[PDB]
Design brief:
part of a larger assembly, 1 chains, mainly alpha, DNA-binding, Histone H2A.Z, dna binding protein, Homo sapiens, ATP-dependent chromatin remodeller
DNA sequence: TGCCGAGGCCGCTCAATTGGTCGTAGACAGCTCTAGCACCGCTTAAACGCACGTACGCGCTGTCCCCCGCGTTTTAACCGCCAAGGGGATTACTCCCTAGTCTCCAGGCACGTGTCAGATATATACATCCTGTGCATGTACTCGGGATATTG
């Protein structure tokens, strides 16, 4: 019980790391969506919404 | 000679762009939502990733041995051109019809919930189907000789 610190702010990102995990699991994916692979995927989505 | 005829420079007037100013109307940004339900933190008992000789499979390697590449030039018409003709694509106008606006109006159905079932998942036992292996011939192939078709 020490408050909470969202996975977005821990990563350094403005896109929602939690929401995207829960979207990847229950996509047409196989049965194991590692958590470090929702951070290298909020990033390589937010990067277009900068570069575009 | 002549004359003049033909000749070469400079203000109106109109017609697109260009940029400016007016005022007004939804639509954007933002607030407070409040509200709630997802994110998180916190455990657990959990699956599945992963760092790591060795059998050994095959990727790569040192040879010789030839066609298709490589080189030439004649020619052959392919491809380009220009110029003319005809029309059909184009332009500008007038009449016309509906596209579009708004407004009223209903119920069709897409929306939503309320219950809880036939569905399919998961286990254990298991038999069976299917793979990997080993194994004859049968053909589709490459060659040689002659007939038919077609180019020049």
């Amino acid at each position: 019980k020490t408050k909470a610190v969202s996975r977005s702010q821990r990563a350094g990102l403005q896109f929602p790391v939690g929401r995207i995990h829960r979207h990847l699991k229950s996509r047409t994916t196989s049965h194991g969506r590692v958590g470090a692979t929702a951070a290298v995927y909020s990033a390589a989505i937010l990067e277009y919404l900068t570069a575009e």
